[PDB]
């Protein structure tokens, strides 16, 4: 009752079209988008932001972590 | 007021009034999701990745960079 996932992978790329799944079981997507906006400092005070805006603004956050 | 352009050390806040919908329009979400996959060295190649599991594995990627 309550578990963690101890797993790591380091090979490179991770590019692909992938395969589709039954989208969201426990509204897991909604939990993820909350935690994304907390790790990303680039949120203005008094904004809700759309589901698509979060994705784009997470990429800008990762650009500074990778190569400026 | 209207977001003053000064040097601060605060994010938007955290949680707020949850009001939004999945727009997508053309395919713009998946264009962001592909650009996420480019920066993730934890994905095999052509595996089962829903729009949800991409978010989760991008958080796991950021957990390696933050070390939580």
Curated annotation (Swiss-Prot), chains A, B:
Domain bHLH: 14-65
Tissues/organs with expression: Expressed abundantly in lung, kidney and adrenal gland, but not in adult brain.
Cellular compartment(s): Nucleus
Induction: By phorbol 12-myristate 13-acetate (PMA).
Function recorded in the entry: Transcriptional regulator (lacking a basic DNA binding domain) which negatively regulates the basic helix-loop-helix (bHLH) transcription factors by forming heterodimers and inhibiting their DNA binding and transcriptional activity. Implicated in regulating a variety of cellular processes, including cellular growth, senescence, differentiation, apoptosis, angiogenesis, and neoplastic transformation. Involved in myogenesis by inhibiting skeletal muscle and cardiac myocyte differentiation and promoting muscle precursor cells proliferation.
Assembly and interaction partners: Homodimer, and heterodimer with other HLH proteins. Interacts with COPS5 and COPS7A. Interacts with IFI204. Interacts with GATA4 and NKX2-5. Interacts with ANKRD2; both proteins cooperate in myoblast differentiation. Interacts with CLOCK and BMAL1.
Name of the molecule in the record: DNA-binding protein inhibitor ID-3
Species the sequence originates in: Homo sapiens (Human)
Lineage, highest ranks first: Eukaryota, Metazoa, Chordata, Craniata, Vertebrata
Location of this fragment in the whole protein: 29 to 83 of 119
């Amino acid at each position: 009752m309550g578990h963690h996932h101890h797993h790591h992978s380091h090979m490179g790329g991770g590019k692909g079209p992938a395969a589709e799944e039954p989208l969201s079981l426990l509204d897991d997507m909604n939990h993820c988008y909350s935690r994304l906006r907390e790790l990303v400092p680039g949120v203005p005070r008094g904004t809700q932001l759309s589901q698509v805006e979060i994705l784009q603004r997470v990429i800008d956050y990762i650009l500074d972590l990778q190569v400026v």
